[PDB]
Design a protein around this nucleic acid. Sequence first.
DNA 1: ATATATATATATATATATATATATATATATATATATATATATATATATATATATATATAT
DNA 2: ATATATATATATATATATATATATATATATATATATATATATATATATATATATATATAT
Lengths: 151, 320, 47
Amino acid sequence: ANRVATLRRRISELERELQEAEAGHIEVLETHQAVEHIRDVYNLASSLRADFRRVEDSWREADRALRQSIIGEQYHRGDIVERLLNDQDALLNTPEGRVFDSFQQQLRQSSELKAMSERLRVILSHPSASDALNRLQRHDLRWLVKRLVDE
Amino acid sequence: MEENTRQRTENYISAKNQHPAWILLATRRAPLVLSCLKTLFEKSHDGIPLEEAIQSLSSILIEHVSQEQYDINQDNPFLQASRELREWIKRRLIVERDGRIFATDALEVAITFVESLDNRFMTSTASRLSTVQREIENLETRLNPNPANRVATLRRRISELERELQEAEAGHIEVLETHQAVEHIRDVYNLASSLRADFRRVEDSWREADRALRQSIIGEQYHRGDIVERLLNDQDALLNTPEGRVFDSFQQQLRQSSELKAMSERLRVILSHPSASDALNRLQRHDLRWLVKRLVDESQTVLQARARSERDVRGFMKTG
Amino acid sequence: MEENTRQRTENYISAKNQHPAWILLATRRAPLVLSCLKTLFEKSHDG
DNA sequence: ATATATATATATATATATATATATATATATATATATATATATATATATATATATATATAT
DNA sequence: ATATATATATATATATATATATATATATATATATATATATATATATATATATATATATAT
């Protein structure tokens, strides 16, 4: 009931915005606020790239721990046969691996990524963006999807 | 210009030799100082009454009696705390104002670095990839003024929402599984807690503008020549473009009390979910619970500071 | 947790001595190293 | 006239030896800087005595 | 009622002790830089062994 009520209020709000738009009450952001919004969206986007280098370290640490445990257990086969029969990856580093895997599941919805890539270029084509972000930042934000997928 | 990189190297050298945050992290006692300062400022809501600060710092020093390697004396923790507070005030990483102590930008940056060393909240997450998607989708609709595009976007989003409503009517709704809820709560805490970051810097910017204005007035042997340009308008003389106007726009959103009323209930409702027990520790739950009031109180303090500075500089262009 | 009040100083003491990032910020040559590395990795994060 | 198995010639690849330059590990010396210790001076707070401003009690 | 003595409110002067502020000098730790020896790596000349290419020669 709460879900349907919230969606019913949201759809009515969108209808009101549509009614205003039909009347011609469009108001785009000035430069003063467009610069701020562009900077904010840049500061959010650039964080997606932050933790790729730590997932690798966590997985390597799990690998070293697993090998040391295997060597230490001089007389136990049950643990290794348990590991091998499991269909899951041997390096279940819960704190980082699972979050990264769920993030990858999102990265593979190419429909959203294409729209995001187009929107990046369109935003960077606006006159205000040249003042909001210097050259290097504009370049970095322009190639975000490519480097995300490559990493 | 490529020489900007060499200029950046010079800037880094200057920051190394002059910035309180980098200065602190290079000393041999930095771990103890940072731990004590964080333990002091962690629980607080708005500054610390100075006397209250002394007692808490002395109690913490007593918690560090076993740490005698840093000269933590048992004879009198009160005197030690009194000495330490002035030691840190002299380093201008904590400041004294209105009978209470605050943490300046340098200490905030240092603590953010230290506590982001190892166990920081993950930013590379599906939740943030949805957040940036939504935000970038929203920004484009407001960057272009074409009416056909706007109406098309609205009349397609209406169809999406209508389909989702029809599906929810059939009962196909679904809630977050425990791990998604944990991740989303962590991401939302990471977003919300960042609003409070820049209050300690707006004040520095306004003080910088005030000092620049006074230096410009005093530096001309004949003040009347320039005072005319300043006093010709009734608006605030602290016209700090870099941060003042951004903060003013942020106020222009804070004063919409309806959003705050909704947020106050929504945050506590979110914290009521069982998964919030695991996603956030007790301290983070406390900080996120009172964040709505904390932002407003901090904004009132900052606005009062600006009012004081503007009034007391207007009392200076006159009589000059 | 409550025991964090005491464990945090040990954690920070270990970090200041072990973590490469905090070691680098403590050396006397840090600014040059940071500027050179930032310039190296400015153009490309792909490796 | 082609396959199929030796034989010979040639080229390639490898091993040995030496010369030259560079990298790494270890040890030591040096310098710098940090932090501390020490010494001195001054500031602040409290206590006690006297002076100035104002009023009341005691003895006859 | 007169005459004497004392007390109350407030400040200033002087002394005592605590504490902070300032400066200097010192010891210490540490970073760092250098030097030495050793090992390692690359290049060139030559000897050695392997492999391939070409041709001869048997059998169909």
